[model samples]
Target: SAYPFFRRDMSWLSFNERVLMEAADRTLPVYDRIKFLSIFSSNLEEFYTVRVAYHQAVLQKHILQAIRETVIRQDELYYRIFYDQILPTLEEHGIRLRTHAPTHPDHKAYLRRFFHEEIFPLLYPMLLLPSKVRTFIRSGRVYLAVRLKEKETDEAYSYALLNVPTDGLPRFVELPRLQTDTFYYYSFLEDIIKEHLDVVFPGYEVMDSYSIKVSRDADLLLDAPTRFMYDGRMPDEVLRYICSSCDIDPEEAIRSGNYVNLQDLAMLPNPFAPRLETLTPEPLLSKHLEQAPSLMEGIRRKDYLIHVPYYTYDYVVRLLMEAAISPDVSEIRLTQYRVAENSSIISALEAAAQSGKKVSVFVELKARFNLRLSERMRRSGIRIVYSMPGLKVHAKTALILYHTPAGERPQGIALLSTGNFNETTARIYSDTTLMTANTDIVHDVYRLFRILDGDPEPARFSRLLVARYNMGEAITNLIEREIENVKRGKRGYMLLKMNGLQDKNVITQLYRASEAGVEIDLIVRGICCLVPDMPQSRNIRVTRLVDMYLEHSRIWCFHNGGKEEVFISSADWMKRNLYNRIETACPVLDPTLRREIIDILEIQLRDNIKACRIDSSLNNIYKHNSDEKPVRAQAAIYRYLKGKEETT
Candidate 1:
């Protein structure tokens, strides 16, 4: 009845569509809806520049067309919501979004004055021939196209383009409202350009105005073949912008119509103080760590996990700081992919290096995105290693080696996580960080960091499974055990949660498990190529839950013949993660922590409101509810954690 498997690109589009659904949710605050819209916009921009950009680079015609069509369809829905739903809600809350020429007599005077004083000085337009096709459009910039005619003549109209200076000026500008005090009016900068078109062209009457923007294929990752297949040198003025935010690499850029950077919607200013955003909750701190001798001493006692955003990130920073200051600490090593600007982690690392402790950081300078801090660290006697372009380092594992007192053994601790060590993202992105003094995991982490720095060592790991060595085989063996358990008349259960899953080998393994009567529930938050086929995939159910927080932690569970096993990872089951990148999946050894993770997954599984079952068509159908009360996973997780704190 179905295609057996869905296309990866389309599945991602479905994932984004689920994000759009959150924006359309009427129960949320008007600003919160706008926030989701901004998220969707940013996600799409990144996707186009990175993924579709790669498609265009490799000349994948079908993939590009599918994305365009699917994006157009989803675009229609969002624009519909903006105009039909969001607009009215904004209006009801005393905010008006002005998108075109203002007919209101009271505001037109103010707009003209505002344009002359604020906008006219910043305006510049390039003339274009009506007959000749031009390709000099600036990449990754929105522009206003104008069709003009001479003041008193009907001769053929001339054309010109003006780039909306959103880079330097506000994309959304506040307008003076002389007509009313009850409401605030804001206008798009491009529409402001439309308000005074004649000033730019002294003798022409502003006949028509429209918005246009171009997205340059921002060749971000996978070393696109066509990205390097350029025939002409990038003009010197624009060469420096190659692989900049515009998504267009030095080789080329693609053109498109209308607004390209909808992410700017977040800049819309709102003066109405009447609550328009969600109240941020305070981060929970561990009371257990408060009485410990030190951050290192606390972890030395037992392994613990920090569920970020819900928990304070200060604990991690404090640990780094302590290691930096500790005279007993001799060395510290970590991996960097994405990190916060003005980061406490960088400060700690720099301080450690300055204090005569050996600091080694594998800085992924080419990481999809940086390292001025790398230079500062090097100056402070730290070792900085640049990333190998194609094989990017993405593991969020850190090792701290502490010197012991005379004749005492050395102590080491490791911090393994599913996300980056970025404190900014830690405030919003839901991620997991496991801090442990467990000998096996710490040894493996230390060895892995050594491997990154080209230190030769035997590839033997006992607990923490590293990619390219044992992670894939270990996961495969675990799934096979579940299959065997079911065959032996024992209950077989598997719950896997991650951002994306497209590895065919693993998908095939899952299909086999499904056929063997091993029940599997997958909580995949992003693209999922594997689908429920009528013949072979009936027992597998896929769900995606989008809510206030981004579900980022990778958790895998298997019922090992009544004895449960759990693991948290920084890797998804994507092909790049499995075979190419240096990913790690660590076994959650503590029974209590393992049970805590399972409980959270169970809560997510019980979600009937935000959770969407991924059907064969990749449609996001909200999980139906039979219970009397609704359950939103993000909110429920907060409550659950808060309750756990009191109970334990």
Candidate 2:
């Protein structure tokens, strides 16, 4: 605690708060605001279920208490945004969601029919009796706890629970559109069930009903962690009975609003918004790629850099498809950490193998869901290599080998990126990728695949910084060089952008550089542990941005005496990213590419609206300047790249 660092979880919570700030923005479209609310809720659920579960397993009482307190406050703000801002905005668009039983007789009649026909068959309510067979509560799913009293006998209450079946049906059911009504009406799935509770428990009287959800430790490698949460007004008897039966610890329980698992809000239907009328800017075609005969030929002629979601991802897919059957191509190699469902990229690799092009894939099976894809790839004659023991390959890279001409060897095209090769995420995550035929970088990528292919003794890298090999040391040396330059009376500066920065040693190195008067600017999206603006870190400034696209790229730029060096990598400054994973950072050797990276960094640094300064207390203070024009990074980047589409 004495170290000048913030708790990782608290920093993450701060990041989530920034996400909520997006939902609270009054200037955004209603549907866009709803999207942010869903993102915020999904983020918190994962935080509690996965991250906080680890804290509970270790019995970090103070940290758990802090999380509880912080979440309670955040929940209050979340609901305020939902009820005060989002609901009213939706109503303006003629969309109404009935959370409780409606007073209208026609609506009540429709709900009764829907519940019996659609919901009644799915309800398998169980009595909360520890003396009899104990009912097991499923994790991350909501259940309705009810108190029922026998009508014929004396007043004796019994507790029962019915699962809110969200898997087979949508969470928000659309009611029949009425000709007389101007508004489109909808109802929560649980509310529909709530309205028909009297019919289900005919012999007894339904006293009260509240939604409850449990989050259990899903860390397959760990202990019994439980976070029992329920509606605030849930009675003691039902709460105690359910907790006793589920064996949930009281210390881990959380008091919540009427509805639990609000992450389901992500599926909230937007009846007014059209699919093609999304607020997201359309992905632009790359001028370099558009002019080329094919993606492989484009890379062979000149190196290309693309910022995805702003630029179309079709070029990446095109490169693979062209290489699949090209006579000039001899082999294709790729690393897969995560693959999209029914991925066209994987299919391209399969086609390449069928063409007898010696396709090789190194998959991090630890990604778990990649099993079916791996099996399918193996069946297609592609050589599939599994993960290494105790280490996950997190590098996003690929190498294509070119056939020799007249018995002479030729260099291949290499794909180095700051994000995954996932197709769906490419449109939603802001990332940078380089397609090049630069021999040094390509050879290094080849060497990395060899290492992943079980090559124990590999040659030292010449132009790439690879984790578990040279990345950590190379990064430290770069920082130290900046410090040395500052001491020698030359300019010393650095600009770093990544999703996380949680390693203590790296932060210490940064602090030492800051003390030496090296100016540092960090654009970190989440989990930044470094405490900037402190006496020791006076020369460092931290910035975070949460906008239309997720900031998923990892970029580092160092002003090496003005002849700058820039890098795009798959790794962050986090301990696990730097030491426990196989990651690659390729230097931008091309002058034009390096300048483009710097220009993009400048655009982000100047962003006044979507960007926030991360202060020492871990508060997100919005950046503002009255003297300058307001700048939004994502929009500016889109326009900047779109301008490049033309010859001008």
Candidate 3:
């Protein structure tokens, strides 16, 4: 019973551990398995940078007394998972990650040559002496710690810090050909610099070199009211404060001049001699373009759905390009949280604006790490609107207003999405985009725009659910409907797919529905606070999918008297989406599109390969079946869409 309230951070670690499990799955392609490793590493970096940073700050500020003990326990569990589970898994894959002193002899030699050729010239070593020098280290950069001795006096000296030049160079260097079975060479940037310490401390005899990385507490120190007051300005101020406050001189901190940021490891080229050929001609783009015509026609008929990576992201771009040049199109409006550097979406909007179409872009400058990019877009003459105070503008939707020759009200085409509008992520994230011209949904989107455009009052919705208006109420009512259906001796079921489901109210409502004999199935990609398959939650089942592509699409389906009501949403089941942000959940009005959404969910539900079932014990167990055929949702969806093309 006590385990019902699992610690949030520990639950998150379990989710990531599930991600690591995929790398070990022999069913996946070798290269794709490597990609999973990269994903796990990247995800861990962000978790440390944001979540761990917050926890560290609480402890530093003497606020741990106010915080729950579970927080610290969760933090410890995170490290345990990495050291025990993740490290061993990597070792099994022949990835030997080690400290500076005792690297494999072959790797050490390769690193020595690499440092001489690439890293040595890029570094500007600073001596941390009391005279004429004040050392300043940049936040998030890695450096090395070095101790030396005077050759003549034989006097053992203290330590000095050396900054690794990873910002301008690669973190892992690939070595020359080796005879071992597909042997790949890799070394940390810090290790490379440590191997060449003689060059850094010219005449001194190097005694020892150790590797260390400093992580600063970067939590924005703003109260709720103050945060709301500042709103979009918070990001700029926070960045400035971090830049100024992170004044640790590595040379002084380490007492030996040495360190480097390890992120550059991502740019390292693969050293393994190719055994398998890379997937041909970019499969995703080729597939989407081939289906564009019929898919666009389908949108015209009713709402059409595109599942990313598996179904190509190019259609979303092509749709915009077509709208940009279409004579009937009069206006285009979108809320931008994050977009690719060379975004075709931005190019289409710019082209539309230049063509004299009414184009309004709500560019939220506070989209976590995209402040600089958002500012650059604003300067390009895009009509940018900052997010509302105390609310994050995260909903990804595009509205295109078109006027027909006939005397009718201008019709709108709305694209509702789960992921950002960036084309780059579209190829790697498993998300859904809904294209529709339904009048009811369009009107609801227009109302959302009014709210996004700084309207003080909330807007009403007829078919779509808008947060701050009726999203929470609507979701709760839908769950209650399932409960009532079960009471009437009917089959009652609810299926939900989201990035997270952490709000207490929503969790409790689902629990209530489950207690009332409603079958609840949750496919949460991350951070689920609800415990499933308990005495109280016997009717509820929770599973998470972490694979080659991020599970990002948020879909809610409820069986109402056997007539299922399906909706594709841009909002997660989180408090911020419901109470603070401007979010939209549009019903799949067309029966065909509704069936398509169901098909996508059904495929994911049956996945035994990448999906991990979370039970009441909080243990992430692999969903295995002896008889059922293996279902990989992303790969299966791609084949399903491709088959649709063949049929047509």
Candidate 4:
């Protein structure tokens, strides 16, 4: 009855297009642009494997076609950005990316020698013939499809496939620069292999080489949906034969550029002079944490908020470190999702267990953790609770509780976050973590750990909004409250920021609120299904920001008749997040912390450089108001937080 929502996959494509747009932008550094293209390439690869596979399995022809068309168009732009913009820019900056056979005699001889020494040993080519045995084509790996003719008979032709050895070697090999040339030269390992094809096949006339890749459904193999990406120059017969031999559906084949897996472009060596790359602001230490004796002490005085990648993750690690060594601290609890290798977080937990503290960690079954660390943590006597069946626990939370006698005061610190606890990702992901010693929030965090421990009939949370119990209903009620505020002639508005927004039920709630004259501004970095500017969403606007760091935090602010409620959540509005996963949304109770979050949100909203207004047609219309001074939110946020660190 309301305005139709944009298809989730289509909307996601729009977001990816924004990433591709960054690659085409002339303002960014060439390497940064290349990074964006690499991101775009990998993003599409996963989209094809998972999202497109689901549609293909269900025989959703229209969606499949739309996704194909959108991706094809984006791929075209992707190549243009690489060839037309980045390549030229790299050349101007004294770097040459060799695309074809090197013309210089020295460079050509160097490549031949390098190929014979470094690459020839790893070569394995299988000839494709109707009568011969079929070779298994591994998924996501690029293969060179070579058409060759025997020297004895010109008419005798054969097709052979060899996997690109990217697993063992670098994708781009640095070639020695000529004596007179100023540019540092590099060539794709595939190109080098292509250059020295004669060594691999003796007594054969090489006709042509085409890049081909098969992306099979990584998830459910139901229907074995495959996506065949081939070089545009590949002949129809060769493509058909390759697909038939590999057991891939011919209809799934799509013509692509000479490169199939451009995701490797991220590893393209930067041989250019220094300062040609984008250098983000150095992460600053939290002043409050630095001055306080410990994280527990810091939170005891007041709640602390940290914007990661801007604020160093040392404070979070320090909290665990202190909890591990503190004499009074008796227990430590945390939820682990994706973890970093040789993680300080994991080490601290292990130390805590070794120190006789009761350490419990709820880890997702699908999450990453090095086997050695897992075994070590287990051996350290830490209680490791794996994920529950049919559900994924996505909440980023932890608690530290201290022993207390009958008359003594209890000490506790609760950590609520909108991102993973992994230190590696914290360096590149934009997220928020609230470290507080508030009694009720600590209680709520303890309750969540109990639930994760398989507590049946879990006690209700009085402070935190948790999924599968209260998060969805609480969000709906918040929207209804805004609608009620509008009805009472009071101003109603909401500012929601997340990576995705695809839940139709919550979207309907938003539409209802917008129809009631409540303003709703959504900052979604990825898929957004809700159509903006319609009659039902006249008061709604969507903003998308793509920058150096991934916008991973989920923050929601609802203006309840001027009393604003701000929350940082680990859940997006997506159906899988709200209904399927165990998520947490922690409210900002400290007024100063609330204001700080609101201020950052305001800065993001005012951003004219990186922010784009997502239109009803799912277009990223770059915000270009020349009247106001340009405010790049990421830079501004760094400066803002830096200023805060300096002021106190």
Candidate 5:
């Protein structure tokens, strides 16, 4: 507590502000600009639902008050970009997004017909009476809290709730093109329904409507009996109920703020605009593996890497499919923190289970006690394990064990990654997954999964670092080793690319290393608390980059007496990632792959265009270089990797 640190919640708000800045970057195409707005909206929603919810529950009034002020100021910027900039720009491209109902007779008549046919069926107005006012609004949905009065008598003024049917309909309704002006016309569901409230309540005169939404604390405190968790707390909690450990529900947090679901901006129709979004890259394939008869043969030869979106996610799915069908395969195990809604990954595992091969998965059960998929997967012969309330298995790991007789060859594989196994995220998130046949690394993965499948006491981890067992202590040792090297007149340097770094012990260790003259560069995209300009942190530089693809993929580098040691992990330097969950940090064993990782990190470090500096004040000031090339890291990495490929 004596060391200098910023509040995690405030620091997170600063990150969202950087995202908001991207929406104002005129050089970005229209949809990409709107994409940033959507990201900013979605990010803030979570901040209220979880972070603000946590603060309120813990009774941190000053913190909550500060959040309220900053968010108001931040949202002022958010809407200005959406309305003042984005909307006007869309008009230039022959499109009009109207917040009010269209004035044209053709478009007006068109919407009235749409209301009766499409929108009318979904309307369920919850009218409030003085005795029992309707108040239970669900999180993550948008609704119109309206004012209604008697149509014939012009009396009996009242309030009502009409949920904008975003579920069954689009947020932006594209209306019939008026022949007079050569522009595509669209209206918000809020505006459309508000204008036609007379039909929703036939006798009521439509007074006016305001957009309103509530975000609840999504915290579900589970008392899972897994042996390693430190009380098994996860940030994503939900609904209206109160947990005895924490004070207010998400309801209390909602009682405070109102930034309804703005993620709907992504669905707004562009109609015919081209080059309005970033172009999709061709996912590079391994030349060596591409020529191999099968994915098994490629892994058997050497370890390979999957750089997602830039490289196909097919190899990951292909690996699991091969294992499921392989006669030599004996067992399959995986740990899922967040999975895809309709995952092909699930299908592969289910197929294996259906085929009577042993399949085991550790599912992190959230704010609820039980579910259908977990139950169904169990009934299908797959053994499902859970972290209940104590620990979250946040590591993205997969192990395929094959026992071979004298006539056969070795056939075991392990995959370690920084992102979830979810298909939806793999497409947009800049994440990395290492697929390997290395005996030591794969066996370490086995020990980890065994612990998740109910090993009471912790086992010693030798190769790969495991959270409760060794990750925290191992990170401390690495930092101190750098300090020792600097003491002996050797250059000590470290680079960490992570989503967050809030664990006090790790920050203190890094501070000590910085004082010893070690250079530390941190690429933290969210929730960074370590202040960089303090005397103890003189040699540290903090950077936050928000670009086309998310700057995900956690990597840690240590210049151990000039021979660099690098690791890619699913864990950040946060307390929960280090002490309370099952996480893995795999060493970049191949020299070529290690160097490639270092190069990708260095490119981002040199990005003077899109990257922002996170200093003591946490203003998120953009770093600039007048003479230097506009080095946007994602595009540079795309070009860099296209030139580097082999068996791995």
Candidate 6:
């Protein structure tokens, strides 16, 4: 329907703009709104480091014209949206994030105190006067390009660089509490340095100091000689190339450029301490170790549901830990994409290998932004299988092969998850994990490994909807079935909850289903391209929930006659998940688990407090409620799980 597909960078910027809208939404709690602001800042930092970095590289290589004109057009739109919309909205919230000099008096006072107590001692100011010491400031490190003048001697002035002590001190320091509860205050560490410029350089009149962060082109392009290449067998070659390329380094790039990585403001601590409720909980893996036995027993029986944060991530960790130690478990195969630092998942696999178990980890080293973690895990004894050059191993799956005492064939236990096995994310991210010994499903899971291990020919799949296989068709068919049911005058509805929904193909299918009068409800936490309430999309409705915690679960349910078919998936309704990545969507076989998914979705749908409805015009309107009770999805989900726990 359009020429030169939407520039990925601009599409991402648009997505961040929506996030900014959430931050500005008055309906959200005050502290929750602050969290959104922090998240927006964090997102922009990554955008500059990765996406903008690549564009700069393209321009430097004189290959800017190779990119579509739409990209250039979209870049202009990005700046317009940021300046005209985002900045104003942020200011309306009383967050005066400005360059130094125009800072609020309260903020100025806070910075002065912050400098004396925390920053002054760490300050190492250097003059760039063709000196060897001055030549060594790292590229991305924040340095004050100072221009100094002496009142006594008008003949000569000196230039210096004061490294902003961002690494040692907090980003935002809280001042003494003021009278108003609404009067929250924060100042950038750079602002603090600017306030005390005279202190950094004695006996000099500071003319001006502008804080600037440098950003360098960080993309590592490989150029391997035949000697370096191990005839296509050298797994370490890519790492070698990366190490060499990153050596161009941030410090070197900053001196030559005006500014490098000023966005270090993201690392600054919040000026005010956020309430525990406002801050999203970190994924806790250790708790899962304590609850392993009972959870494993539940898994052995059939399938169990573990709602993150509320229920704990222990169920997922326990399964892997139990398998790692079990003598009966002969082999363990799993896909490692994005995991936590000192990941429990990797540790469990290492234990399995130490216990003389065959451990194969399909480590997607190319997992965007998580390459280093993947590389570290690969170096730690697990048999690492680098994914196909272009294809991403995005599947969240684990297969444990167990052998019984009786000399029978090895049986398999498959753990299919809607999120990464990373314990850190599992705590905060609301996702599902299906632990089953279902032989049929395990067979297909094994076949996926075969394809990953270079089968050359595509493997056949049954029971599971796998990307690069039949997931797209399977999802479409499910939607089409609802459309048929609607035509027959029966109750036809589809409920899908995912982190993102931007794929045009899936959106078109949902649109068709909506046009056919199939009631479609989507609970998307992030990017959503589907526009609702148009003449063609009247039956489809979209709602976004931004609350205390991130909504990371992906669930799809389709009503068929009186019964319902439900699936919990790792894949989002995005092109990469449907076509490029190795993803999995498993059916909710257990009745209780299926009911739990339905309950969560229903709770989200009923939410009038945190959920915002997306109209066809892309405006996010609050889903108002005149009822006595206001339904908050996360809180309700917690209560629902707690009730189940109490009864059991």
Best by lDDT: 4
Model 2 segments beyond 4 Å from truth? Answer: 1-3, 219-225, 275-278, 367-373, 405-410, 425-427
* lDDT values for all models: 0.78, 0.84, 0.66, 0.85, 0.78, 0.65
Per residue, candidate 2 scores C-alpha lDDT tens digits across 1-648 of 345989999999999999999889888877777788878877877887778878766874488889889988998898888888887877887888776678888887887888888888888877776768756677878889888897666677887889888877788888887668877888889888887888878877898888888777662332444578889898776777886765556677778777777767767777666741247778888777777887777788888898998887777667899999888888899987654366778888889988888888777765344567767777788887778567788889988998777545348999999987666642289999998999888878877787788777465888998888988789989999999999899999999999999999999989888889999999999999999779988999999988888999999999989999999999998988888888889999899999999999999999998899988999999898878998999999989889878863
Regions more than 4 Å wrong, model 4: 152-154, 178-180, 218-225, 338-340, 366-371, 406-410, 456-458
Candidate 5 on 1-648: residue-level lDDT in tens?
Answer: 467989888888888888899999988888888888887887777676667667766874488778877876886787688778998998887778886667788788988998989998998888755344424555677777666677567555567767888889988888765468778888888778877888888777767665655565642343550000011121222111112223434323322222346788777766775556778778888888888888887887888877876788888778889888888789899887643254788888888888788999887756554357766677778887777787878888988988767555345899999987665742288999898888788778877787777776359765899887788778889888998988899999999999998988888888888888999999999889999888989999999998878878899999899788889899888887887877889998999788888998999999988999988988888899889888988888888888776424
Which model scores highest in TM-score? 4
What is the Cα-based lDDT of residue 607 in candidate 4? Answer: 96
lDDT of 6 by residue, 1-648 (tens): 321123344345555556666556655544454455556656655655666566665655722232234333433444344446544544555454453443467556766776887899898887755434324444345666666787677746556667877678756555555566454445556666777889878879987654434344442344651001011121232223222433442212211112223233334343445631265434433233245555455455565566677766655556678887887777889887645466677778777777878888886665344457556655655677777578888888889887755655346788888877675531256667777877777777877887888876456776887988888788878888888888889988988999888787878777777778888888887777776677667887888876656788898999887689999898997877787777888987777778878988899899987688876545567787887488888878877776665553
Could you tell me the C-alpha RMSD of candidate 2 in Å? 2.5
Ranking by lDDT: 4, 2, 1, 5, 3, 6
Which runs in model 6 stand beyond 4 Å of their true positions? 1-14, 25-31, 52-147, 151-161, 172-188, 219-295, 338-340, 367-381, 404-410, 425-427, 455-458
Worst 10 residues of 4 by lDDT: 217-226
TM-score of each: 0.90, 0.95, 0.80, 0.96, 0.87, 0.74
> What C-alpha lDDT, on a 0 to 100 scale, does residue 648 get in candidate 2?
35
Q: Report the error of model 6 at residue 390, Å.
A: 2.7
TM accuracy, model 5? 0.87
Better of 1 and 5 by TM-score: 1
User: Which consecutive 10 residues in model 5 have the weakest lDDT in total?
Assistant: 225-234
Candidate 1 Cα misplacement greater than 4 A, ranges: 1-3, 103-106, 130-135, 151-155, 177-180, 218-260, 338-340, 367-372, 404-410, 425-427
Which runs in model 3 stand beyond 4 Å of their true positions?
A: 1-3, 26-31, 59-118, 127-134, 152-156, 176-187, 218-265, 271-298, 367-382, 404-408, 454-458
| TM-score, prediction 4 | 0.96
| Candidate 3 lDDT, 1-648, residue by residue in tens | 233555566677667667666656656545455555556555655765677657755654623222224333433443354456544544566554443444466666766766787788887875445344545544456655466675677554645667777678767655554567444445566776766888778788887655545444442333440000111212332223222343322211211112223234335454443532135223444333355565445566655677776666777677788887877788888987645376888888777776777777775556454456555655554576777457767678888887755656447788888877675551267778887888777767766776788676446776987777787788878888888889999998999999988787778877778788889889998888898877667888898987666788899999898789998888887767688876778788778778878887898898887778897766778888869887877667777666665655
Candidate 6: residue 60 lDDT (0-100): 51
